[PDB]
Short mmCIF file of C-alpha atoms in Angstrom, two decimals:
data_model
loop_
_atom_site.label_atom_id
_atom_site.label_comp_id
_atom_site.label_asym_id
_atom_site.label_seq_id
_atom_site.Cartn_x
_atom_site.Cartn_y
_atom_site.Cartn_z
CA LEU A 1198 210.18 130.74 99.97
CA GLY A 1199 208.88 127.33 98.99
CA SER A 1200 205.11 127.70 99.21
CA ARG A 1201 205.12 131.01 97.34
CA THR A 1202 207.28 129.36 94.65
CA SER A 1203 205.19 126.21 94.37
CA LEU A 1204 201.74 127.89 94.42
CA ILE A 1205 202.30 130.17 91.42
CA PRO A 1206 200.06 128.01 89.14
CA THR A 1207 197.20 128.26 91.67
CA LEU A 1208 197.70 132.01 92.17
CA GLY A 1209 197.61 132.39 88.39
CA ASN A 1210 194.60 130.13 87.79
CA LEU A 1211 192.44 131.74 90.48
CA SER A 1212 193.47 135.23 89.37
CA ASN A 1213 192.53 134.43 85.77
CA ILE A 1214 189.11 133.10 86.80
CA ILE A 1215 188.41 136.20 88.91
CA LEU A 1216 189.50 138.55 86.13
CA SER A 1217 187.30 136.81 83.58
CA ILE A 1218 184.29 136.66 85.90
CA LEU A 1219 184.55 140.25 87.15
CA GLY A 1220 185.59 141.60 83.76
CA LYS A 1221 182.19 140.74 82.23
CA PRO A 1222 179.58 143.48 81.59
CA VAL A 1223 179.08 145.41 84.83
CA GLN A 1224 175.47 144.23 85.23
CA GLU A 1225 176.62 140.62 84.79
CA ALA A 1226 179.56 140.84 87.21
CA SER A 1227 177.53 142.80 89.75
CA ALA A 1228 174.82 140.14 89.57
CA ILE A 1229 177.34 137.40 90.31
CA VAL A 1230 178.71 139.16 93.40
CA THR A 1231 175.34 140.35 94.74
CA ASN A 1232 173.60 136.93 94.33
CA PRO A 1233 175.81 134.37 96.09
CA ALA A 1234 173.12 131.67 95.84
CA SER A 1235 172.90 131.69 92.04
CA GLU A 1236 174.79 129.01 90.12
CA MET A 1237 177.58 131.35 89.01
CA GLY A 1238 177.44 133.26 92.32
CA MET A 1239 178.11 130.08 94.31
CA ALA A 1240 181.01 129.19 92.01
CA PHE A 1241 182.45 132.69 92.42
CA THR A 1242 182.18 132.41 96.22
CA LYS A 1243 184.25 129.20 96.28
CA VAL A 1244 186.84 130.70 93.91
CA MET A 1245 187.05 133.82 96.10
CA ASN A 1246 187.48 131.73 99.25
CA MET A 1247 190.38 129.86 97.69
CA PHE A 1248 191.80 133.14 96.37
CA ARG A 1249 191.72 134.74 99.82
CA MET A 1250 193.67 131.76 101.21
CA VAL A 1251 196.31 131.80 98.46
CA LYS A 1252 196.64 135.61 98.58
CA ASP A 1253 197.50 135.42 102.29
CA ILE A 1254 200.43 133.15 101.39
CA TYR A 1255 201.82 135.91 99.16
CA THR A 1256 201.06 139.08 101.10
CA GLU A 1257 199.93 140.34 104.46
CA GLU A 1258 199.05 143.69 102.84
CA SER A 1259 196.53 144.68 100.17
CA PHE A 1260 198.64 143.76 97.12
CA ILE A 1261 201.53 141.46 96.22
CA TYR A 1262 204.98 143.00 95.85
CA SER A 1263 207.01 140.45 93.93
CA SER A 1264 210.39 141.99 94.76
CA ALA A 1265 209.53 142.11 98.48
CA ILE A 1266 208.81 138.36 98.57
CA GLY A 1267 211.61 137.22 96.26
CA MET A 1268 209.35 136.30 93.32
CA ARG A 1269 211.84 136.98 90.52
CA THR A 1270 211.30 134.71 87.47
CA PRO A 1271 209.39 136.01 84.42
CA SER A 1272 206.48 133.64 85.05
CA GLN A 1273 206.38 134.42 88.78
CA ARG A 1274 206.34 138.16 88.13
CA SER A 1275 203.78 137.87 85.33
CA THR A 1276 201.56 135.89 87.71
CA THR A 1277 201.84 138.37 90.56
CA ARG A 1278 200.97 141.17 88.12
CA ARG A 1279 197.81 139.28 87.11
CA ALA A 1280 197.03 138.63 90.76
CA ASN A 1281 197.26 142.34 91.58
CA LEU A 1282 194.77 143.13 88.80
CA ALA A 1283 192.40 140.46 90.12
CA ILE A 1284 192.77 141.88 93.64
CA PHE A 1285 192.02 145.41 92.42
CA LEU A 1286 188.95 144.35 90.45
CA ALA A 1287 187.64 142.22 93.32
CA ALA A 1288 188.17 145.14 95.70
CA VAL A 1289 186.14 147.47 93.49
CA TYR A 1290 183.33 144.91 93.16
CA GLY A 1291 183.40 144.35 96.93
CA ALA A 1292 184.64 140.74 96.93
CA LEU A 1293 187.72 141.94 98.83
CA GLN A 1294 187.87 144.60 101.56
CA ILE A 1295 190.53 147.05 100.38
CA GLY A 1296 189.95 150.69 101.16
CA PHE A 1297 190.13 153.47 98.62
CA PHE A 1298 193.28 154.84 100.27
CA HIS A 1299 195.10 151.60 99.38
CA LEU A 1300 193.61 151.43 95.88
CA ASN A 1301 194.93 154.94 95.18
CA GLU A 1302 198.38 154.36 96.72
CA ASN A 1303 198.90 151.14 94.72
CA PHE A 1304 197.17 152.14 91.45
CA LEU A 1305 200.33 152.73 89.42
CA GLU A 1306 202.00 149.57 90.74
CA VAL A 1307 198.92 147.56 89.73
CA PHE A 1308 198.32 149.08 86.28
CA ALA A 1309 201.83 150.31 85.32
CA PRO A 1310 204.19 147.91 87.10
CA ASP A 1311 207.94 147.66 86.55
CA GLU A 1312 208.54 151.31 85.51
CA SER A 1313 206.55 150.85 82.33
CA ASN A 1314 205.43 153.89 80.33
CA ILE A 1315 202.35 155.59 81.77
CA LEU A 1316 199.63 155.71 79.11
CA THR A 1317 196.81 158.22 78.66
CA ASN A 1318 194.00 155.78 79.46
CA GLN A 1319 195.80 154.72 82.65
CA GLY A 1320 195.97 158.39 83.58
CA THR A 1321 192.26 158.90 82.96
CA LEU A 1322 191.51 155.82 85.08
CA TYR A 1323 193.82 157.17 87.82
CA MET A 1324 191.91 160.46 87.92
CA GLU A 1325 188.50 158.78 88.16
CA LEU A 1326 189.74 156.45 90.89
CA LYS A 1327 190.93 159.45 92.91
CA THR A 1328 187.53 161.07 92.35
CA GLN A 1329 185.70 158.03 93.74
CA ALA A 1330 188.13 157.85 96.67
CA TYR A 1331 187.33 161.50 97.40
CA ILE A 1332 183.57 160.91 97.17
CA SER A 1333 183.72 157.86 99.43
CA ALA A 1334 186.00 159.58 101.95
CA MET A 1335 183.61 162.56 102.09
CA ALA A 1336 180.73 160.20 102.87
CA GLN A 1337 182.37 159.17 106.18
CA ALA A 1338 182.27 162.81 107.42
CA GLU A 1339 185.67 162.13 108.96
CA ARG A 1340 188.00 164.86 107.64
CA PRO A 1341 187.55 168.10 105.71
CA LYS A 1342 187.41 168.11 101.94
CA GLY A 1343 190.60 170.15 101.61
CA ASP A 1344 192.61 167.53 103.52
CA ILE A 1345 191.16 164.66 101.49
CA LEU A 1346 191.83 166.41 98.21
CA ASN A 1347 195.43 167.32 99.05
CA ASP A 1348 196.13 163.65 99.79
CA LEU A 1349 194.41 162.36 96.67
CA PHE A 1350 195.59 165.08 94.24
CA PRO A 1351 198.97 165.95 95.72
CA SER A 1352 201.43 168.67 94.75
CA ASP A 1353 204.30 166.17 94.28
CA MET A 1354 202.65 164.23 91.42
CA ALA A 1355 205.54 165.09 89.08
CA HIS A 1356 208.24 164.00 91.52
CA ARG A 1357 206.23 160.82 92.06
CA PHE A 1358 206.23 160.09 88.32
CA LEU A 1359 210.00 160.60 88.11
CA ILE A 1360 210.68 158.50 91.21
CA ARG A 1361 208.58 155.59 90.00
CA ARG A 1362 210.68 155.15 86.84
CA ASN A 1363 214.12 155.93 88.30
CA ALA A 1364 214.59 159.25 86.47
CA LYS A 1365 212.06 165.30 82.26
CA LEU A 1366 208.35 164.43 82.39
CA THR A 1367 206.68 162.64 79.50
CA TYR A 1368 203.80 164.19 77.56
CA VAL A 1369 201.25 161.78 79.05
CA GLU A 1370 202.61 162.43 82.55
CA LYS A 1371 202.24 166.21 82.21
CA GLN A 1372 198.77 165.76 80.71
CA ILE A 1373 197.77 163.67 83.75
CA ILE A 1374 199.11 166.27 86.16
CA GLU A 1375 197.15 168.95 84.30
CA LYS A 1376 193.97 166.84 84.14
CA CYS A 1377 194.31 166.00 87.83
CA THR A 1378 194.82 169.66 88.83
CA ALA A 1379 191.64 170.61 86.96
CA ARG A 1380 189.67 167.76 88.57
CA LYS A 1381 190.87 168.76 92.05
CA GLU A 1382 189.64 172.32 91.53
CA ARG A 1383 186.28 171.20 90.14
CA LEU A 1384 185.88 168.88 93.12
CA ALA A 1385 186.83 171.48 95.72
CA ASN A 1386 184.58 174.22 94.27
CA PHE A 1387 181.59 171.98 93.49
CA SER A 1388 178.36 172.68 95.30
CA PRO A 1389 176.43 170.92 96.66
CA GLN A 1390 179.17 168.43 97.62
CA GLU A 1391 176.63 165.69 98.38
CA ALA A 1392 175.64 165.75 94.70
CA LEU A 1393 179.09 164.68 93.50
CA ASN A 1394 178.16 161.01 93.32
CA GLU A 1395 175.36 161.81 90.87
CA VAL A 1396 177.87 163.85 88.85
CA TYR A 1397 180.52 161.09 89.00
CA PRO A 1398 178.34 157.98 89.45
CA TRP A 1399 179.95 154.83 90.79
CA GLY A 1400 178.38 152.65 88.10
CA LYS A 1401 180.16 154.69 85.46
CA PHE A 1402 183.49 154.20 87.21
CA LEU A 1403 182.81 150.48 87.53
CA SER A 1404 182.19 150.31 83.78
CA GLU A 1405 185.34 152.34 83.09
CA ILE A 1406 187.63 150.10 85.12
CA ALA A 1407 186.30 146.72 84.01
CA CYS A 1408 186.48 147.70 80.34
CA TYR A 1409 190.09 148.80 80.79
CA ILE A 1410 191.05 145.68 82.71
CA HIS A 1411 189.22 143.58 80.14
CA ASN A 1412 190.24 145.36 76.92
CA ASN A 1413 193.92 145.56 78.11
CA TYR A 1414 194.38 142.02 79.44
CA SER A 1415 193.23 138.85 77.77
CA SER A 1416 190.33 137.04 79.40
CA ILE A 1417 188.78 133.55 79.75
CA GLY B 756 182.46 123.85 81.40
CA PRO B 757 181.40 127.31 82.57
CA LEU B 758 183.84 129.84 83.96
CA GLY B 759 184.93 128.90 87.48
CA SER B 760 183.61 125.36 87.28
CA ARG B 761 185.48 122.03 87.40
CA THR B 762 187.22 122.45 84.05
CA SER B 763 188.31 126.01 84.94
CA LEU B 764 189.98 124.91 88.19
CA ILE B 765 191.99 121.98 86.72
CA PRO B 766 195.34 123.84 87.04
CA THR B 767 194.69 124.53 90.74
CA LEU B 768 193.74 120.90 91.38
CA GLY B 769 196.89 119.64 89.65
CA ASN B 770 199.12 122.20 91.36
CA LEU B 771 197.92 121.42 94.89
CA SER B 772 198.04 117.69 94.05
CA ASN B 773 201.65 118.04 92.87
CA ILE B 774 202.55 119.93 96.06
CA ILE B 775 201.09 117.18 98.26
CA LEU B 776 202.90 114.54 96.19
CA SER B 777 206.17 116.47 96.55
CA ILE B 778 205.95 117.12 100.30
CA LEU B 779 204.68 113.68 101.22
CA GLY B 780 207.28 112.51 98.66
CA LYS B 781 209.95 113.08 101.31
CA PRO B 782 211.50 110.38 103.54
CA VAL B 783 208.87 108.77 105.76
CA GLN B 784 210.13 110.26 109.04
CA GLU B 785 210.34 113.72 107.46
CA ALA B 786 206.91 113.52 105.83
CA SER B 787 205.37 112.08 108.98
CA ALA B 788 206.83 114.81 111.19
CA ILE B 789 205.45 117.51 108.87
CA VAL B 790 201.95 116.14 109.44
CA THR B 791 202.20 115.22 113.12
CA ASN B 792 203.76 118.55 114.20
CA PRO B 793 201.48 121.27 112.73
CA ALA B 794 203.35 123.97 114.66
CA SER B 795 206.70 123.64 112.90
CA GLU B 796 207.56 125.95 110.02
CA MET B 797 206.99 123.22 107.43
CA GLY B 798 204.04 121.87 109.40
CA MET B 799 202.34 125.28 109.40
CA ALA B 800 202.88 125.71 105.66
CA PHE B 801 201.62 122.23 104.82
CA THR B 802 198.48 122.92 106.84
CA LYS B 803 197.67 125.90 104.60
CA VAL B 804 198.19 123.78 101.45
CA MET B 805 195.97 120.99 102.81
CA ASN B 806 193.22 123.50 103.67
CA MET B 807 193.29 124.69 100.05
CA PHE B 808 193.33 121.08 98.81
CA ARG B 809 190.33 120.19 100.97
CA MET B 810 188.39 123.05 99.41
CA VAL B 811 189.25 122.31 95.79
CA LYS B 812 188.62 118.59 96.33
CA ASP B 813 185.08 119.35 97.50
CA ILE B 814 184.54 121.06 94.16
CA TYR B 815 185.40 117.83 92.32
CA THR B 816 183.83 115.18 94.57
CA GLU B 817 181.40 114.57 97.43
CA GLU B 818 183.23 111.29 98.29
CA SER B 819 186.80 110.19 99.03
CA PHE B 820 188.18 110.21 95.47
CA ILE B 821 187.51 111.92 92.14
CA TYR B 822 185.92 109.91 89.33
CA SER B 823 186.49 111.90 86.14
CA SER B 824 183.87 109.94 84.19
CA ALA B 825 181.34 110.71 86.91
CA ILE B 826 181.86 114.49 86.72
CA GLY B 827 182.47 114.80 82.97
CA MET B 828 186.21 115.60 82.95
CA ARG B 829 186.53 114.53 79.32
CA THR B 830 189.79 116.00 77.94
CA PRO B 831 193.02 113.98 78.29
CA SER B 832 194.73 116.57 80.53
CA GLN B 833 191.63 116.71 82.73
CA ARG B 834 191.59 112.92 83.17
CA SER B 835 195.30 112.84 83.96
CA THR B 836 194.82 115.59 86.54
CA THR B 837 192.08 113.73 88.39
CA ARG B 838 194.17 110.53 88.40
CA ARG B 839 197.08 112.42 89.95
CA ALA B 840 194.76 114.12 92.43
CA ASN B 841 193.59 110.65 93.51
CA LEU B 842 197.16 109.57 94.17
CA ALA B 843 197.59 112.67 96.33
CA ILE B 844 194.36 112.00 98.19
CA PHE B 845 195.60 108.46 98.93
CA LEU B 846 199.09 109.61 99.96
CA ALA B 847 197.59 112.29 102.21
CA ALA B 848 195.27 109.71 103.74
CA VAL B 849 197.93 107.23 104.77
CA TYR B 850 199.99 110.08 106.25
CA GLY B 851 197.03 111.31 108.33
CA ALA B 852 196.73 114.59 106.41
CA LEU B 853 193.25 113.53 105.26
CA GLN B 854 190.77 111.48 107.29
CA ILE B 855 189.70 108.62 105.02
CA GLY B 856 188.95 105.25 106.57
CA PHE B 857 190.71 102.05 105.59
CA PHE B 858 187.37 100.90 104.13
CA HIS B 859 187.36 103.72 101.58
CA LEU B 860 191.09 103.21 101.00
CA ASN B 861 190.57 99.50 100.37
CA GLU B 862 187.51 100.00 98.16
CA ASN B 863 189.14 102.63 95.90
CA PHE B 864 192.64 101.12 95.70
CA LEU B 865 192.34 99.63 92.21
CA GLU B 866 190.56 102.71 90.85
CA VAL B 867 193.35 104.88 92.28
CA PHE B 868 196.32 102.69 91.35
CA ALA B 869 195.01 100.86 88.23
CA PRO B 870 192.39 103.12 86.63
CA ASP B 871 191.01 102.67 83.12
CA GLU B 872 190.90 98.85 83.31
CA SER B 873 194.65 98.46 82.86
CA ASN B 874 195.77 94.86 83.44
CA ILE B 875 196.82 94.56 87.08
CA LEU B 876 200.55 94.35 87.71
CA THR B 877 202.03 91.96 90.27
CA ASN B 878 203.46 94.95 92.13
CA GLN B 879 200.03 96.62 92.37
CA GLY B 880 198.57 93.39 93.72
CA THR B 881 201.42 93.15 96.22
CA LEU B 882 200.68 96.59 97.65
CA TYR B 883 196.96 95.77 97.51
CA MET B 884 197.72 92.77 99.75
CA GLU B 885 199.84 94.94 102.05
CA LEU B 886 197.04 97.52 102.33
CA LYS B 887 194.47 94.86 103.16
CA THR B 888 196.97 93.64 105.78
CA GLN B 889 197.28 97.08 107.40
CA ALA B 890 193.53 97.63 107.20
CA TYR B 891 193.09 94.36 109.09
CA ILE B 892 195.67 95.20 111.78
CA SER B 893 193.91 98.54 112.36
CA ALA B 894 190.46 96.93 112.30
CA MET B 895 191.57 94.49 115.01
CA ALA B 896 192.83 97.34 117.17
CA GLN B 897 189.39 98.99 117.06
CA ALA B 898 187.94 95.51 117.74
CA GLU B 899 184.34 96.56 117.07
CA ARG B 900 183.78 93.57 114.74
CA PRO B 901 184.51 89.84 114.90
CA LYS B 902 187.72 88.62 113.27
CA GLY B 903 185.86 86.68 110.57
CA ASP B 904 183.72 89.66 109.56
CA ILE B 905 186.90 91.71 109.12
CA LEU B 906 188.83 89.06 107.19
CA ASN B 907 185.77 88.57 104.96
CA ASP B 908 185.61 92.26 104.04
CA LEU B 909 189.32 92.71 103.41
CA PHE B 910 190.19 89.27 101.95
CA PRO B 911 186.90 88.27 100.28
CA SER B 912 185.94 85.13 98.39
CA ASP B 913 184.67 86.87 95.24
CA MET B 914 188.13 88.32 94.54
CA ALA B 915 188.00 86.42 91.23
CA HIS B 916 184.65 87.92 90.18
CA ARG B 917 185.87 91.36 91.25
CA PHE B 918 188.93 91.16 88.98
CA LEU B 919 186.69 89.97 86.12
CA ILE B 920 183.97 92.58 86.72
CA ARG B 921 186.65 95.27 86.90
CA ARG B 922 187.71 94.77 83.27
CA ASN B 923 184.29 94.06 81.71
CA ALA B 924 184.81 90.33 81.24
CA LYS B 925 189.36 83.64 82.68
CA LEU B 926 191.78 85.36 85.05
CA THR B 927 195.25 86.45 83.99
CA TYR B 928 198.18 84.43 85.29
CA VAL B 929 199.15 87.53 87.30
CA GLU B 930 195.63 87.91 88.74
CA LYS B 931 195.47 84.31 89.97
CA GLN B 932 198.93 84.79 91.53
CA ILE B 933 197.57 87.76 93.47
CA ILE B 934 194.60 85.81 94.79
CA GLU B 935 196.93 83.05 96.02
CA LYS B 936 199.33 85.56 97.58
CA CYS B 937 196.18 87.11 99.11
CA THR B 938 194.55 83.93 100.43
CA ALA B 939 197.87 82.86 102.00
CA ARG B 940 198.28 86.27 103.65
CA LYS B 941 194.74 85.87 105.01
CA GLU B 942 195.40 82.39 106.43
CA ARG B 943 198.50 83.74 108.17
CA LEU B 944 196.51 86.62 109.65
CA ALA B 945 193.57 84.38 110.59
CA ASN B 946 196.09 82.31 112.65
CA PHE B 947 198.62 84.65 114.30
CA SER B 948 199.23 84.93 118.05
CA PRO B 949 199.88 87.37 119.60
CA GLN B 950 197.38 89.20 117.40
CA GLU B 951 199.06 92.46 118.49
CA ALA B 952 202.50 91.31 117.34
CA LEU B 953 201.23 91.73 113.76
CA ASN B 954 202.29 95.37 114.16
CA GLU B 955 205.87 94.08 114.52
CA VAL B 956 205.54 91.42 111.80
CA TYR B 957 204.40 93.96 109.16
CA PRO B 958 205.52 97.41 110.36
CA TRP B 959 203.30 100.29 109.30
CA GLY B 960 206.31 102.43 108.39
CA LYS B 961 207.29 99.65 105.98
CA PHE B 962 203.92 99.82 104.21
CA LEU B 963 204.08 103.63 104.25
CA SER B 964 207.51 103.49 102.63
CA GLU B 965 206.23 100.98 100.03
CA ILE B 966 203.18 103.07 99.11
CA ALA B 967 205.15 106.30 99.04
CA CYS B 968 207.95 104.77 96.97
CA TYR B 969 205.38 103.26 94.58
CA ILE B 970 203.51 106.54 94.20
CA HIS B 971 206.77 108.52 93.92
CA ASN B 972 207.78 106.25 91.02
CA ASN B 973 204.35 105.77 89.38
CA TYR B 974 202.82 109.26 89.29
#
């Protein structure tokens, strides 16, 4: 498709700006998003408005799936990978409205795309994301904790790892499964449940994810 | 500049400019249909590009065109990007994709087509005369102003001073040729009946094709 082909430089430029704004120290990035009338806040708002428009050209869902839209060249795929990181970081800072269910479902495609090797720090980030999804889902008083936890920390994690790389399990993969199992149990047996956000504060997760996305992808 | 400011967005400005130059780079009837039928598949897609271009353009200018010296775009690639963006603003304007009056188009023509005090070329002066011609034809349709007021504005007497002032200055042989081609075109327009046959004497689609062809070969 022509417009998706021709707009790759814009997709890339806006994604890079978002990543380098929202990858700053958490206090600095949070300030930018929560003060739209500041100098940098106003500039971020215009960048985000253009980004929302360009993103809609590439996907009607939460993230961009390069294979699904025929984006096949090395530069096209590298750009959509950057875009997906910018989307994820903007979602977690609230600049985009993407629910925790979609963040969890797409986490490996965003941080370990193209059947790459899953790394230990990705696994740790995965576990903390699932923990925040659980804490947020509990706050809606919609479904019981058991149901939430079985979705977020599922029994088929090993088959999912094999499927995603066309495969038995690697050492990191089995460590993640074991770390996730332990976190599920701690979460289910914790009391009082309403205290979990003090135990796993959001600000700490924000700092975890920005540092990863910064210190694993080049900024500016 | 700072993150997310005018220097940060230069690749987006150039990319959207290049897209507008490519799409309105098509044959006149094709390009015109894209703009005039916003419901077609191409028309719908072009609309989304133009909405993005409108937003990025506002970041670079409050007016019709982008003056790099006015907003501090100092690096060579930055200055070349604003120059190209100006060509795309002008191409979009004559196709109806952007709403910029003939007055703004006339006033910014040399800055758009001959920036940086380059010596005017006879071809640039030709198209300048053709643009003034079309701006007159349109101004006489609207018929809010007397014929002399309109010919004054578009074919003015101080055309000599303007060419001199433009390059910090006596005219070049080419520049005095343009003024005489201009004055003669004015006399013909000041004395043409029916005044609404001028649309047939100089067809708009001919001008459009001349501008587009010029831009398509000089951007």
